Scaffold this active site. Sequence first.
Site, short mmCIF file in Angstrom:
data_model
loop_
_atom_site.label_atom_id
_atom_site.label_comp_id
_atom_site.label_asym_id
_atom_site.label_seq_id
_atom_site.Cartn_x
_atom_site.Cartn_y
_atom_site.Cartn_z
N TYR A 1 33.26 -39.53 -24.38
CA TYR A 1 33.52 -39.32 -23.08
C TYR A 1 34.18 -38.07 -22.64
CZ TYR A 1 34.61 -39.82 -18.05
OH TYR A 1 34.55 -39.69 -16.59
N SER B 1 27.85 -40.43 -18.07
CA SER B 1 28.43 -39.58 -16.98
C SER B 1 28.96 -38.49 -17.49
CB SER B 1 29.78 -40.72 -16.88
OG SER B 1 30.33 -40.03 -15.63
N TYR B 2 30.44 -38.29 -17.54
CA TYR B 2 31.05 -37.10 -18.00
C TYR B 2 30.53 -36.85 -19.42
CZ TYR B 2 34.12 -32.97 -18.88
OH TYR B 2 34.66 -31.79 -19.32
N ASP C 1 21.30 -43.05 -7.93
CA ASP C 1 22.70 -42.63 -8.49
C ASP C 1 23.15 -41.96 -7.36
OD1 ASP C 1 24.92 -41.40 -9.80
OD2 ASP C 1 23.99 -42.21 -11.56
N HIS D 1 25.13 -45.51 -10.63
CA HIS D 1 25.48 -44.48 -11.73
C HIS D 1 26.07 -45.61 -12.76
CE1 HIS D 1 27.50 -41.13 -13.54
NE2 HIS D 1 28.52 -41.78 -13.62
C1 LIG Z 1 31.38 -40.13 -14.80
O1 LIG Z 1 32.29 -39.74 -15.73
C2 LIG Z 1 31.81 -41.69 -14.57
N1 LIG Z 1 31.45 -42.40 -13.66
N2 LIG Z 1 32.00 -43.69 -13.77
C3 LIG Z 1 33.03 -43.52 -15.20
C4 LIG Z 1 33.50 -44.50 -16.31
C5 LIG Z 1 35.20 -44.18 -16.23
C6 LIG Z 1 32.84 -44.21 -17.73
C7 LIG Z 1 33.16 -45.83 -15.88
O2 LIG Z 1 32.69 -42.31 -15.76
C8 LIG Z 1 31.17 -39.36 -13.21
C9 LIG Z 1 30.67 -37.79 -13.80
C10 LIG Z 1 32.30 -37.16 -13.66
F1 LIG Z 1 32.47 -36.89 -15.04
C11 LIG Z 1 33.04 -38.01 -12.76
N3 LIG Z 1 32.62 -39.13 -12.73
C12 LIG Z 1 32.89 -40.28 -11.58
O3 LIG Z 1 32.36 -41.20 -11.52
C13 LIG Z 1 34.30 -40.04 -10.99
N4 LIG Z 1 35.40 -40.00 -11.83
C14 LIG Z 1 36.72 -40.91 -11.77
C15 LIG Z 1 36.32 -42.06 -12.54
C16 LIG Z 1 37.92 -40.12 -12.43
C17 LIG Z 1 37.08 -41.08 -10.19
O4 LIG Z 1 36.18 -41.92 -9.58
#
Ligand SMILES: *[C@](O)(c1nnc(C(C)(C)C)o1)[C@@H]1C[C@H](F)CN1C(=O)CNC(C)(C)CO
Lengths: 728, 728
Positions: B509, B592-593, B670, B702
């Site tokens: 992550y 995601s990230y 998304d 997402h």
């Molecule tokens: C992504 O990191 C993401 N969305 N949901 C999640 C988890 C925590 C794995 C469920 O990761 C996405 C892309 C960026 F990295 C930021 N982001 C977000 O959704 C927003 N980041 C938060 C969770 C800190 C605020 O909602």
Amino acid sequence: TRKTYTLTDYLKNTYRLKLYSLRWISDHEYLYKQENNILVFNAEYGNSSVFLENSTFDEFGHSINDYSISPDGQFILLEYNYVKQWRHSYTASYDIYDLNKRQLITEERIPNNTQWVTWSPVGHKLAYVWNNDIYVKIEPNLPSYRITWTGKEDIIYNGITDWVYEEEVFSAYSALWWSPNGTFLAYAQFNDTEVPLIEYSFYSDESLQYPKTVRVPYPKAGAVNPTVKFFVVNTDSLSSVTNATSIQITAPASMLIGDHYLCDVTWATQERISLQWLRRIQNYSVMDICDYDESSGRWNCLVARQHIEMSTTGWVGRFRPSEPHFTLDGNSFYKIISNEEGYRHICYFQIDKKDCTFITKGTWEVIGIEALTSDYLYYISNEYKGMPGGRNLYKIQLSDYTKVTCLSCELNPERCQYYSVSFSKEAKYYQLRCSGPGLPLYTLHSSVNDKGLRVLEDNSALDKMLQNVQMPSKKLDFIILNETKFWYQMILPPHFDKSKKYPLLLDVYAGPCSQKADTVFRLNWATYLASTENIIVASFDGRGSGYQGDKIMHAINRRLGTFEVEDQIEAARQFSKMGFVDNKRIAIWGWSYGGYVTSMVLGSGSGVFKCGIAVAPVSRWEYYDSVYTERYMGLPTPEDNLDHYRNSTVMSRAENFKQVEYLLIHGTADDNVHFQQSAQISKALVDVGVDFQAMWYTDEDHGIASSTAHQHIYTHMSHFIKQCFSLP
Amino acid sequence: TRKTYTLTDYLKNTYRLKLYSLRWISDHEYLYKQENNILVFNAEYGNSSVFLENSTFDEFGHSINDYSISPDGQFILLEYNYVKQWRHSYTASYDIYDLNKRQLITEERIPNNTQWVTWSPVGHKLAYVWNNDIYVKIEPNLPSYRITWTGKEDIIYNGITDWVYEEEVFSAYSALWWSPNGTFLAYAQFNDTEVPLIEYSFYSDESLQYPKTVRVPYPKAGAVNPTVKFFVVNTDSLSSVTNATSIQITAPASMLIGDHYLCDVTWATQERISLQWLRRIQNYSVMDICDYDESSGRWNCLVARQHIEMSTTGWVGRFRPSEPHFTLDGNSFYKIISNEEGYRHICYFQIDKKDCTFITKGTWEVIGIEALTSDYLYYISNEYKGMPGGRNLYKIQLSDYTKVTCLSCELNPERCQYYSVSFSKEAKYYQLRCSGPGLPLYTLHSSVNDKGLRVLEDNSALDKMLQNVQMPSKKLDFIILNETKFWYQMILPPHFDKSKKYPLLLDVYAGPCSQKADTVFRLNWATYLASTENIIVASFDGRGSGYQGDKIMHAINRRLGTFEVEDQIEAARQFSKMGFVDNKRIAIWGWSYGGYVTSMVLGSGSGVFKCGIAVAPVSRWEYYDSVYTERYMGLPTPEDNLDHYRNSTVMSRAENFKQVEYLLIHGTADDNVHFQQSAQISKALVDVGVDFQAMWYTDEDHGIASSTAHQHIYTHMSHFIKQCFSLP
Ligand SMILES: *[C@](O)(c1nnc(C(C)(C)C)o1)[C@@H]1C[C@H](F)CN1C(=O)CNC(C)(C)CO
Ligand SMILES: *[C@](O)(c1nnc(C(C)(C)C)o1)[C@@H]1C[C@H](F)CN1C(=O)CNC(C)(C)CO
């Protein structure tokens, strides 16, 4: 030992096929570009001269996309800043060079972003659409008479078609037909106002922070169709002080009762025009012949000169009611239509007599009328040797319909079986385009006695190369079903040894009036599959195909996605048993409509196909455009053909996809077959639990034609095939 | 001889992990469902009665999604017709049931489509949002008073947040807050007028003929942000005068100079409230503390009760400035902040004094404050055993900060190292929630003496089934770099033999302040991967991760796509050294990230990894929301941090994917990490001619959480890993 035809040799063009594009300027002279330098040619002796040194605009400033030389030649249009739109449209910037005073006209030029421009048929009058409005210019330098003022992006279209008419009706962006000598400028008008829009993200470069939403007026099955109008204006009489008067030519009474279309425009004489109208329910169409009443200024069309073309077995024509061909005087035209046995032959028409006398007949058809002198009508057909997949030039003596002469059949039966032609101004001379089964052959001929002046191109070069590479072989044979033969072709590998088991890939399109089994020579992906992967690539034209009569082509009227699917299977199965095919290695792929057949098949339950690729498929029919869809399917209503519309869907067969390895590809910027269509398939495949492959192509259209996206989409596909057939 | 934990077991949830979610409704009674019927437990004795018989809302005629009983236990809000939206937002229909007259209120009913509701924290007042407008109800069965008349779709939000505040700030939809006794109703209001719109398409159901286009106000990095305004209305004074009035509270002027956000809203007393303002440049925030002036009728916020909180190393707070916990007399609060060392700790504040005093310190971090009584304050930290991936409840005496007791640490040390708690209304009772590393355990305790009352759920039932299955083990050690230790965790296959080389899948992550290494027990995809495919699965919390000090978290401020990436790789290199990791089989996969780092890691050119997977990754930072992207990246201007923005896209490392096997997956709907992001990645690979695997997911967000898609995405990924590691 020798190399084979590799995928690299395909996507790259290591082996380029030579053409010979010439444009007849007179009745005995044609232009031909040679080394960026355009030469002029004398069709008789074949001598030539440097019409325009390739160096002329050596410092024009812009890259010159294309050139059009004015009928008389006193000018040459210059196209640059080209930007493709759909299949036939685009906007570009122009410049006119006076080929005399060697000057790039500058006073009053064609605005930037010009939607389409056209010379008159004679002389040098220009005509152009910009901002949806028609503009005329009698002189290259003089200002221009704005003919229309209704232009308004995405709503009104004067002189240019809309999405639907350009694709499914006029296979061209243009929509204005000059008159023979250039006195009358006719033009159609489309009002998309209440037409629903398709909308899709376009992601542009990598810098566009927010994806843009492309929104086009596009009518889907059962939707709200665009309206049309026809106007004509005298070009000779246009006041610089006042606004032109375009006289409308309303559609007939049986045509205005309901939704309709303008399916074909054709000028008869310097004062007569003929219009063919098609009903939204495409089994009925009416041709009007309007004469010009010098007095009234108006145009009149004597109902006693009205003609009807209808069908009880299906739609009208092949894809649209064929165009007419008038005599010099304009009191009679020849037009291709289907006789009472379901074939399309040539019919003779007296402009004010109800019945037409066919001049040809038989169990073959006429591809098209190519020339009409006072003693002859030249046409292209597939009569010769009874093979519907071969075309030949013929001429029928208008004074004695039994004195037909095939000017191409025996020219070289071995090498040539598929011909195409080009006639100079007064059909004095003609060029014959032989595109298969052997390497293309271009030759020039003369009408006076059908003497073969000379050979313009023979791809000898290519040839010499191809003898060092193991090219595949082709077989065009057929299979009798219900006493009716359906043809097919197989691309066989080199050294094809019948004592073995070759995996097979069925190449399918299977759309209405299609023909995938013919005599043409091709350098395509299959040439690679066959040559390097030793994979037999087939193709089969079954119920649905054309060029063989209505009984077959209409066989699928109202039943798209039935017999043509079932028939693909059939041939497979039959193939599946020929000893040289490995029935545990039969795939099937398709593009566009083929993608649709490829999908419907993989979801059939036949267990005949191991895998399959569907490119830009059609999931259900309600998602496609009206004009095409309804032509074959009718209306999406309970009172009409909703059950079959609902039955025909790919989606409803999702669970059967469980017995087949499937690959889905679509280009997110497809304006023809909306991504929405695959997007809907996959969701269905996800809800039934079938796993499959997929790949989208950012910003590509129904063509996935961008270079990189092209080499990539084939490179991906091959891999999908080799993995399925277990090839190294 | 026992079967393994299979993929299906993961998707079908065969080994159900139990739990015990309760809701305190007092200081000694909590509500629990226990076979469809809300019961009322009494902490002191555990006895219990049916509060709401399951067969109550039987002839309701709708599938109830949730119930909400009013604080006084006099009513219950039945929520149905659930319609999700974003992360937390959603729309519903409601109905109140007069528990006492056991009847269903039919007059003055809540409007269908209410975007939000909330009982007052006392008695039974109702404040719901409907059409971006707030509405209050003194009695379930009386009409509503409208609080705001500025509501407007996609423009002005009153009582609910827009997209960026709902995701990146409050982490909730609701943007209103009730005072301790619910006399006042504060609420933020958002105006996204000039905020750009993200526009994606939603294909809907197969019956939707024309694709819908989703357009939503979303501020991407650098773009125009939505402004905010705060107000407070006295709900008791609605019945006497006319229209209602809302007293506005304006942000301090240190914020008014530029763009700013509202990041916290905490009531301190019946008439004292704190607000926290953060500048678009989130490294400086301010806290105003406001009293209700009875003689002015407005909210006075003394600048002498103003507190600043900034960071010179990065941004402020883990994601946002932490919240305060005031003492009863609202004259002092406790708040976690980053000390001088750089570790987050609980400081003590006197509302009118600027220096606070830390009450905890060291090289660990206080996670959060859980309750604050007149004698103790309770918090959760990762101090115990100096294990950052830990969690334990601690007790601190306000009279003596040297008197700290760890109320959970030694309860069961091998089974429980990750706690979470739920105190009763005054903190007389509390429920601890062991989350690992052993099976989750829930107990109940008495505050007075900290003696464990009884056991709520010990998962014995799951523990039995698992004796009969090859479960993988979890090792949580660390390595050492630049003198600093970075913790990691591996999931190990059954009968792990450190003498063998196992294939390794790096789970990542890496987002700033992410903790992927911990002592939490989970049954997820890795479970199956290790228990069935004998694949070692690891994760690494390197530079950027949190809960270990700003010297590790703030390591990547302004530099995303670097340290956290360079590091994840090194960890792979660290793992392979260990000697039971098949250098030839190492794959990475994020989401995601994570997806972004996975992607960066494969284009790294590190030759370390074989294949990888990136679900819904961020491709470039300018395509992501401002609130979040700008918090670690600054502003994409050349005067600011544009250079690193452009210097950290995946699209530029496209040429390097050639050395690996990619698999890009993304939902087409998304709203968070737009499709736009992968569509630019693919297009970037296709341009350099890199083959890869793709898979889109029609209308998934997402979370690609659709039951069928969830099952689909993981099955498809499974196959990719399998072939990648040719197990098979
Ligand atoms: C992504 O990191 C993401 N969305 N949901 C999640 C988890 C925590 C794995 C469920 O990761 C996405 C892309 C960026 F990295 C930021 N982001 C977000 O959704 C927003 N980041 C938060 C969770 C800190 C605020 O909602
Ligand atoms: C599809 O079949 C398609 N697009 N181009 C082509 C060929 C003829 C292979 C070049 O096929 C697509 C989906 C429907 F099947 C119809 N259709 C069309 O593009 C319709 N267009 C023409 C070429 C038939 C006439 O406009």
